[PDB]
Amino acid sequence: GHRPVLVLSQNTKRESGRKVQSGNINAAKTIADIIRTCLGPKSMMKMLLDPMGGIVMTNDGNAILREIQVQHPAAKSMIEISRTQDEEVGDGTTSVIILAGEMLSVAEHFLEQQMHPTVVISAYRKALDDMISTLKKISIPVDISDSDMMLNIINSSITTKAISRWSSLACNIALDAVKMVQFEENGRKEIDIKKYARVEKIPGGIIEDSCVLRGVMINKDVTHPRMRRYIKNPRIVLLDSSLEYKKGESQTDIEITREEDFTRILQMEEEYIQQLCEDIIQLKPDVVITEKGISDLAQHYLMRANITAIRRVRKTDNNRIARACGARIVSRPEELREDDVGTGAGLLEIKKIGDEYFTFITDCKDPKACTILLRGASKEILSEVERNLQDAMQVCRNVLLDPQLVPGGGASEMAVAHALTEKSKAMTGVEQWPYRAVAQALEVIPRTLIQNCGASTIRLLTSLRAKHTQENCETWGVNGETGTLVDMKELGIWEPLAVKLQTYKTAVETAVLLLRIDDIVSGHKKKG
Amino acid sequence: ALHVPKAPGFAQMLKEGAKHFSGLEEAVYRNIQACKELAQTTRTAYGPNGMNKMVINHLEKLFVTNDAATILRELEVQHPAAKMIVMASHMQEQEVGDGTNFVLVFAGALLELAEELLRIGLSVSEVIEGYEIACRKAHEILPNLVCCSAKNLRDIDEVSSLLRTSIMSKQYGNEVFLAKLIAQACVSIFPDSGHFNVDNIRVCKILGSGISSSSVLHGMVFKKETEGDVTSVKDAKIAVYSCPFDGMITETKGTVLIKTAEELMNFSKGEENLMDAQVKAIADTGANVVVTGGKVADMALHYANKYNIMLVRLNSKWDLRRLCKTVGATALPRLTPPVLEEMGHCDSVYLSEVGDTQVVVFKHEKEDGAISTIVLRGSTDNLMDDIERAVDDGVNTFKVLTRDKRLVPGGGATEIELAKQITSYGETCPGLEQYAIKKFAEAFEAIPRALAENSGVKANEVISKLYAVHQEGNKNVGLDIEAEVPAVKDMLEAGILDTYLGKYWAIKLATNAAVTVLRVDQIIMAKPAGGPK
Amino acid sequence: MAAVKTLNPKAEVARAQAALAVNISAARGLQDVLRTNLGPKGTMKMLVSGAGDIKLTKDGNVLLHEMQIQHPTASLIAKVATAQDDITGDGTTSNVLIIGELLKQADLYISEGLHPRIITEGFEAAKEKALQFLEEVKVSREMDRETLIDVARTSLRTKVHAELADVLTEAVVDSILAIKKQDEPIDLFMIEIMEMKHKSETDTSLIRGLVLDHGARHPDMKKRVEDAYILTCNVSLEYEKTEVNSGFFYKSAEEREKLVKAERKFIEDRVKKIIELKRKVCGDSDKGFVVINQKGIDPFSLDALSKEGIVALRRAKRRNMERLTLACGGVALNSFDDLSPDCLGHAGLVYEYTLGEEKFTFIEKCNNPRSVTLLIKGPNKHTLTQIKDAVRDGLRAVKNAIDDGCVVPGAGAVEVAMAEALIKHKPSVKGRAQLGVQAFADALLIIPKVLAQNSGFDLQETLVKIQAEHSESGQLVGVDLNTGEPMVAAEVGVWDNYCVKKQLLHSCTVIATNILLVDEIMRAGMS
Amino acid sequence: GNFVRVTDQLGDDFFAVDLEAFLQEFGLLPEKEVLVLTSVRNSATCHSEDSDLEID
Amino acid sequence: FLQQYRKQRMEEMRQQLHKGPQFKQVFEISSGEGFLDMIDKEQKSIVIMVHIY
Numbered sequence A: 001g002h003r004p005v006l007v008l009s010q011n012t013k014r015e016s017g018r019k020v021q022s023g024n025i026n027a028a029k030t031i032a033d034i035i036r037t038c039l040g041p042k043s044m045m046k047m048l049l050d051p052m053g054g055i056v057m058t059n060d061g062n063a064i065l066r067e068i069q070v071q072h073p074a075a076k077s078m079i080e081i082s083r084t085q086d087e088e089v090g091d092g093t094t095s096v097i098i099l100a101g102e103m104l105s106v107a108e109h110f111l112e113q114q115m116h117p118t119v120v121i122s123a124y125r126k127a128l129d130d131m132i133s134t135l136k137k138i139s140i141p142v143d144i145s146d147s148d149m150m151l152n153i154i155n156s157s158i159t160t161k162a163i164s165r166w167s168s169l170a171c172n173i174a175l176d177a178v179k180m181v182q183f184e185e186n187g188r189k190e191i192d193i194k195k196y197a198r199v200e201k202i203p204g205g206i207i208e209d210s211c212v213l214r215g216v217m218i219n220k221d222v223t224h225p226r227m228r229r230y231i232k233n234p235r236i237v238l239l240d241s242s243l244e245y246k247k248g249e250s251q252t253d254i255e256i257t258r259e260e261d262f263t264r265i266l267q268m269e270e271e272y273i274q275q276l277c278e279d280i281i282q283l284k285p286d287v288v289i290t291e292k293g294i295s296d297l298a299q300h301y302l303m304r305a306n307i308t309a310i311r312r313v314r315k316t317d318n319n320r321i322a323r324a325c326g327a328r329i330v331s332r333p334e335e336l337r338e339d340d341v342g343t344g345a346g347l348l349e350i351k352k353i354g355d356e357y358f359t360f361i362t363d364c365k366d367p368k369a370c371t372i373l374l375r376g377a378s379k380e381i382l383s384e385v386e387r388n389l390q391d392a393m394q395v396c397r398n399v400l401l402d403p404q405l406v407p408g409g410g411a412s413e414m415a416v417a418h419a420l421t422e423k424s425k426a427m428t429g430v431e432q433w434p435y436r437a438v439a440q441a442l443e444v445i446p447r448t449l450i451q452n453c454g455a456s457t458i459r460l461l462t463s464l465r466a467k468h469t470q471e472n473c474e475t476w477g478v479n480g481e482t483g484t485l486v487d488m489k490e491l492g493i494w495e496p497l498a499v500k501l502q503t504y505k506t507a508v509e510t511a512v513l514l515l516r517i518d519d520i521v522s523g524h525k526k527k528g
Numbered sequence B: 001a002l003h004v005p006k007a008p009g010f011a012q013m014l015k016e017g018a019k020h021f022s023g024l025e026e027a028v029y030r031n032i033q034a035c036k037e038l039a040q041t042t043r044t045a046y047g048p049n050g051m052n053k054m055v056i057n058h059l060e061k062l063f064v065t066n067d068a069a070t071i072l073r074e075l076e077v078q079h080p081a082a083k084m085i086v087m088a089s090h091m092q093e094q095e096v097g098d099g100t101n102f103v104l105v106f107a108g109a110l111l112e113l114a115e116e117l118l119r120i121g122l123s124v125s126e127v128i129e130g131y132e133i134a135c136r137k138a139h140e141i142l143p144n145l146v147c148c149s150a151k152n153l154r155d156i157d158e159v160s161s162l163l164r165t166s167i168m169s170k171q172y173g174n175e176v177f178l179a180k181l182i183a184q185a186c187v188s189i190f191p192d193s194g195h196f197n198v199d200n201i202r203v204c205k206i207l208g209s210g211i212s213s214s215s216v217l218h219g220m221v222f223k224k225e226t227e228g229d230v231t232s233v234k235d236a237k238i239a240v241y242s243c244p245f246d247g248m249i250t251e252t253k254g255t256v257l258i259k260t261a262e263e264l265m266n267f268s269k270g271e272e273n274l275m276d277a278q279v280k281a282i283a284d285t286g287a288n289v290v291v292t293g294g295k296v297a298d299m300a301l302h303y304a305n306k307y308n309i310m311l312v313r314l315n316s317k318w319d320l321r322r323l324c325k326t327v328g329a330t331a332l333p334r335l336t337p338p339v340l341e342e343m344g345h346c347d348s349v350y351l352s353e354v355g356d357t358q359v360v361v362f363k364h365e366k367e368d369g370a371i372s373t374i375v376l377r378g379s380t381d382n383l384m385d386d387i388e389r390a391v392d393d394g395v396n397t398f399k400v401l402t403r404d405k406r407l408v409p410g411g412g413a414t415e416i417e418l419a420k421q422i423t424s425y426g427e428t429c430p431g432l433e434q435y436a437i438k439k440f441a442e443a444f445e446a447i448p449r450a451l452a453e454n455s456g457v458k459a460n461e462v463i464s465k466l467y468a469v470h471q472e473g474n475k476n477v478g479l480d481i482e483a484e485v486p487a488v489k490d491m492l493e494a495g496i497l498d499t500y501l502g503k504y505w506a507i508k509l510a511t512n513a514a515v516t517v518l519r520v521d522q523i524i525m526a527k528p529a530g531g532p533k
Numbered sequence C: 001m002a003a004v005k006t007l008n009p010k011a012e013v014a015r016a017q018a019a020l021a022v023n024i025s026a027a028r029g030l031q032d033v034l035r036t037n038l039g040p041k042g043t044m045k046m047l048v049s050g051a052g053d054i055k056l057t058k059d060g061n062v063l064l065h066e067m068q069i070q071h072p073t074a075s076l077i078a079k080v081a082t083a084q085d086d087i088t089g090d091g092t093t094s095n096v097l098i099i100g101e102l103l104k105q106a107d108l109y110i111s112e113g114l115h116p117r118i119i120t121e122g123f124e125a126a127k128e129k130a131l132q133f134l135e136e137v138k139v140s141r142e143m144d145r146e147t148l149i150d151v152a153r154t155s156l157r158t159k160v161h162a163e164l165a166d167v168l169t170e171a172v173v174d175s176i177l178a179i180k181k182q183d184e185p186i187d188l189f190m191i192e193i194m195e196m197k198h199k200s201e202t203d204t205s206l207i208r209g210l211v212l213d214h215g216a217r218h219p220d221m222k223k224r225v226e227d228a229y230i231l232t233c234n235v236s237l238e239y240e241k242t243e244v245n246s247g248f249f250y251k252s253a254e255e256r257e258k259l260v261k262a263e264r265k266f267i268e269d270r271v272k273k274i275i276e277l278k279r280k281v282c283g284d285s286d287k288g289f290v291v292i293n294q295k296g297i298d299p300f301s302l303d304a305l306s307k308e309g310i311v312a313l314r315r316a317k318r319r320n321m322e323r324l325t326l327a328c329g330g331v332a333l334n335s336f337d338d339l340s341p342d343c344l345g346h347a348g349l350v351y352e353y354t355l356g357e358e359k360f361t362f363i364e365k366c367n368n369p370r371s372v373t374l375l376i377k378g379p380n381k382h383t384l385t386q387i388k389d390a391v392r393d394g395l396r397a398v399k400n401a402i403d404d405g406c407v408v409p410g411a412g413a414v415e416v417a418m419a420e421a422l423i424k425h426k427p428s429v430k431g432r433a434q435l436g437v438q439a440f441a442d443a444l445l446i447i448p449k450v451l452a453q454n455s456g457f458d459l460q461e462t463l464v465k466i467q468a469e470h471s472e473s474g475q476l477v478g479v480d481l482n483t484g485e486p487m488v489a490a491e492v493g494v495w496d497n498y499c500v501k502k503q504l505l506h507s508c509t510v511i512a513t514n515i516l517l518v519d520e521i522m523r524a525g526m527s
Numbered sequence D: 001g002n003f004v005r006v007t008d009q010l011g012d013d014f015f016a017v018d019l020e021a022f023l024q025e026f027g028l029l030p031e032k033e034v035l036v037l038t039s040v041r042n043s044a045t046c047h048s049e050d051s052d053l054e055i056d
Numbered sequence E: 001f002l003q004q005y006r007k008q009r010m011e012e013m014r015q016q017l018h019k020g021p022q023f024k025q026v027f028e029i030s031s032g033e034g035f036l037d038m039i040d041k042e043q044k045s046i047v048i049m050v051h052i053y
């Protein structure tokens, strides 16, 4: 048809200049303002409606941000920052977004004037280095062997979540899970909360009945009623290969001419099943767990040896059982060895919860994996409880790997801001203004805590700044429940240094990344 | 100030297509109106004078009948209270086989009188309690109204007289002939053992000669031809095979592996020789009729013709089982010759033409056997369907009589006596349940009222005469159908009697349906959406 | 307007007071609908699906599922009620009522400028005190037959009509007592619930055996066996193909016949083993042999078994293996390699019943059946469904009353006493959480209010009479649904499950606290 | 695939499980392939001179 | 009762807990020529599912 001469495509949109920078900064500010009120011990929860019909009720920043679909690429960058913070340290997700928004605001203040973004970026990087130095300076060590202090750290981590009502139970569950899943092999230490330390939520009951199991629990039942549903000291054998006759890999058509060959073939199928079962029985086990199917004839031959069999178990669940009971998964039954038999599980029991059967292996001696059994009001309540427990376990692992500890309640923010402000007095350049501005941008955390508590922001923040101008007041923060100044070595709110370092680094680098853009091109085909 | 918003709460949360009805006027009265409308639709087909109805379903199939259950089944009932009443009627049909229209009429009358009671001030609970009390009283009274018993079921005359009343409501004009046919068919069945099987009565419908040409055959009739050349056997020795009349084959896969010219030249000859030997072995046992459930091979048919064997192929496994039952043979799973005990026997098997239909008849000379067939003639398919429905009603009446032999007077006499007795009982009950008991008694008037309305006379005069004669002390008096003016007569002498079990179950089911409909207070209906089935 | 709507223009958002009002309105609508369900004097509801199926019920969970609702708060309350039903099996209507009343009482103070956090703190303190009081007031008793009868009646009378409830009470109590083993958890999978559609609703009863929804597939099978040996097996007696693509090859018709005859020898061996065992155990003709197979039986094996006078059933339910093993007393077999008479169960009567096209088999007169069946009978499908729901509720109630060594008085007496205790404890709570404690007590008071309202009496006068009677004497007095006067629930026989009350308190408090703290609702997953 | 008025055979509350099974049972949906849930990124594809070579 | 598909619930479970990064949105075709050259282009052996709505 009509042909208009064009360089780029019709659907290609390009904008540049101060408009792009202002749009990016306001997008980041809006993203921060979305979750501004979900920070602190007095945070309010939010209902998120899934596009799939689900409901998410949470005050965690990452879930709220991941449930929101946005068009502006700056908001997408902010959501990616939230996800990065969640994946790296598992805490501080709400704080990093607010910090990035405040830093971008104070940067926009300078970009309105005739200051180039590169100068602001260099000042921001200098400030970030100084913040890291100050945070490492004001940190204090912790004794990992002290269970009380670890429980206190986990509590101060979870005081801002809905699970804070059952603080002691949640802290004990998280500490026990992290401690027992901790592993050491070949000179390489690991925690691996992701693979092991599985959280299983069964709606109903009371949350005070939730506990961490000394072993693994799965939603499975015996393959046949004659199986024993209660074994005192079981010997467990784990497999992946099916216990049933299966076709080979190659095309293996038979040609039957004699009369008895058909019955002979069926008899050898049965004999092969019997041989596999006898090879299993030779180790004299009590429980056989398979990731794949178990034939009925195999069940009968296992019963002849009084062996309980469970089939169709997930690979992750089977690995967890192997870690818990100290067994090794074996593919070919004829290659079973004595050390592959799992001895160490002190009880196996299949009990009925509600209208379902659940398999419990919950008396292991020194188990390296666990199931956190969560019981509660409903599915959404248990999902929020699981998220809070995940936060607690992440904080526990962070403390275990890095025993440095940092005062909370905004005390660290004010201390770092004061140190950077004092340091900025001896530079006498053009970068001192952005340096000081991004230093004072850290005060958005105590300000947010005061705002959420409902107290007077200006008076309390001025008093806190005046206190931090003194000679030893690095641990003075705000009480987020009463809206009063308090020493954090008395209140007891402390946070891992790793979380604070990650939060500051991520916020500063988000500001730096969003400050480097002045041109936006959109609408072009993906071309691939 | 131009629109009325939805009320906050449940009204706003309701889905777009959903409907919510709550409260007396919004739910109970609407349900009662729907049930009354359904009863009105079915009412005009009650009794001997009930007119037929032409019902065309969604598949253009045409039904001409006065059977209430069939009419309700072919109707597209959408209101769910009327749906419950239809389920009650169908349950009555399944349990007894007759009295569905009674169930519908009684339920409609009960619900109308319940609406009246609710309007005058009574609560739903009081009406339900009174209805249940009156139903218990009626069930207690009913055994005392039994006038006579069957006292014999092997006699043709007695069974015909008993079934005449049952099949007089449908096909009023010609009921003696149908009664005789069904009596003969049922007396053939029902051996010395007390059990009676309804399935053992088969109905074959062939066009052409009017229903007066119908007859009862001691055996079975199949609308098909013979596979072979033999078409008539006089001393049948049927051997029945469930397997196809062909060489048996492997179940996995069969491949003829030929490695030499001799095998290629000998395979077909050997196969044919094996077929000939098998058919000869079958024929050597004296069998002259072979019935198979599968296909018939060409070579097998050729050798059956060679040895003078009559072949009949039955596609339906039910037909094969019925033939085995009516002949006395065992359906062999293989093509082996039948042993003496497994061989069937029949007096005559032959190919015949009735009208323009080719049929195969397995005929017994003796008036005995396990299965009897009624051959229905007629000039229209719909007419034969209606006659088949009447035959089903008669056979169900015979089955009920086998279960319980007690009978109560028909023609509304039992209903009038029940109404009188329940009214007398309720007049002595102090409390608010007396109104419900009296209304339950009055609901029995709907049966004689419907009979009189269909007969073409004034119902009020008939009911007044019935009350007068019953107060006189005659409990066996009902309305005279064969009269141009309101008149009554004794039906113990007239033979117009209906089963006790039918009345008992009909009253129970109608009362249960009415009470269940009354119990509903709120209705929440989803969007109709789809779901054709 | 809001921040979210700027990033996502087509986003639905309710903030602060708007979100709280939305949640409270949804909860109050659910409460308004489910008020009429509570109590034996509640009104039956009528539910018609899209296809047109009719369902009559009074159950709170069923009504919640069958209302046409698309609200998020309704979804959360439905999840809570579903968990309640799954675990305890009772108290869903009370769950919804208490949640709605808690939200309404909280809004009574929040609308006066009070922050919801204080209300939630008061809720937590009141919940702790209420749990302590409930632990104090529970009546520990020896669960004899009479107490279980009272509990089952207290559930079923609410669920169904009084006479049907009276029948079902004995049915469920006897069924539970039959399968119960001393100091062992009760497995409710061992009480089969079977629906038949021919008799009246009061003809339902308990069979000390099993009822199978399938019968023998061979016409020559016996229709009634007096003394039966039960063989429960999971072995395929039908033709089976080789796993490795066997195929046949022959060169003549005689070879084909030989291969056809020889290809069934594998199944014929197992049929021969069964027949040999039958001939060994019962050489005479009086005793019968019954084979119940989870797998299939081909017509050849059916005929072979029938010729030996053995009635056989195929394609039985998987749970029926355990049910028959516990009832008849045999051993379920996955193979016939070593089968001996000690693996045979015994049934004192096995007969076949036919209902239209549907076919049934009865296994009765067992020695000491540890697995029984409940035969639901009725003239309608909706009647059968309602009776099945009522039976489920009653079985759960009896199982809870057995598992718990105690039982709580009903008729709202425990709610009234608990509210009085909360009011007395209120001065001990420091701060403004006393308002939350008062709201919790008022919300707890909803059950007697709704009971009196459903019974037709005046709500406030009846409630104050109950409270005055309780305060005057200290007894656990509840609402009499016939006269409206105070009545001692324990003496009359109105019992409530202790676990049900505890779960009600915990779940209602948790969900109300979580809903009250929600201040922002979003739907921003589009575009 | 010629699916029209899928609500007739799926309803109005069908979840991803229903659609997945409904597509699988006609054999139109490709078989599920196991893959890493999330990991670190590499983002390289061959090219030229991408070869460490032994010194000689 | 294997037909009731208890596994459907856990299928929904890990479909809900599927991935970490953003779940993206369904691509929307705005022009008829867009649909035409979307189906005409792209690799042939890759299934394309279109939802008219």
Ligand SMILES: Nc1ncnc2c1ncn2[C@@H]1O[C@H](COP(=O)(O)OP(=O)(O)O)[C@@H](O)[C@H]1O
Pocket: A038, A039, A040, A041, A043, A060, A061, A091, A092, A093, A094, A095, A096, A156, A157, A159, A160, A408, A409, A410, A449, A478, A479, A480, A481, A493
């Ligand atoms: N009792 C308390 N008093 C004052 N501040 C607190 C208290 N508990 C936690 N905080 C502060 O709240 C912050 C945690 O908020 P949270 O909701 O976890 O956001 P994030 O998930 O981003 O860490 C921490 O920085 C901590 O300093």
Ligand SMILES: Nc1ncnc2c1ncn2[C@@H]1O[C@H](COP(=O)(O)OP(=O)(O)O)[C@@H](O)[C@H]1O
Pocket: B045, B046, B047, B048, B050, B068, B098, B099, B100, B101, B102, B103, B165, B168, B169, B170, B409, B410, B411, B412, B451, B478, B479, B481, B496, B498
């Ligand atoms: N010859 C007759 N005279 C008077 N009443 C009759 C006669 N025959 C049948 N009836 C009455 O008709 C009623 C049967 O009506 P019918 O159309 O069969 O309805 P249903 O099929 O529901 O029983 C019976 O109650 C019987 O009393």
Ligand SMILES: Nc1ncnc2c1ncn2[C@@H]1O[C@H](COP(=O)(O)OP(=O)(O)O)[C@@H](O)[C@H]1O
Pocket: C037, C038, C039, C040, C042, C059, C060, C090, C091, C092, C093, C094, C095, C154, C155, C157, C158, C409, C410, C411, C412, C447, C451, C478, C479, C480, C481, C494, C496
């Ligand atoms: N006979 C009775 N008299 C007084 N109150 C009763 C009686 N039976 C049951 N209740 C009360 O009714 C309540 C049960 O109502 P129900 O409809 O079962 O609600 P839910 O299904 O939520 O348990 C119990 O709290 C009990 O106290």
Ligand SMILES: [Mg+2]
Pocket: A091, A092, A157, A160, A391
């Ligand atoms: Mg945190």
Ligand SMILES: [Mg+2]
Pocket: B098, B099, B100, B166, B169, B393
């Ligand atoms: Mg009739």
Ligand SMILES: [Mg+2]
Pocket: C090, C091, C155, C158, C393
């Ligand atoms: Mg209840």
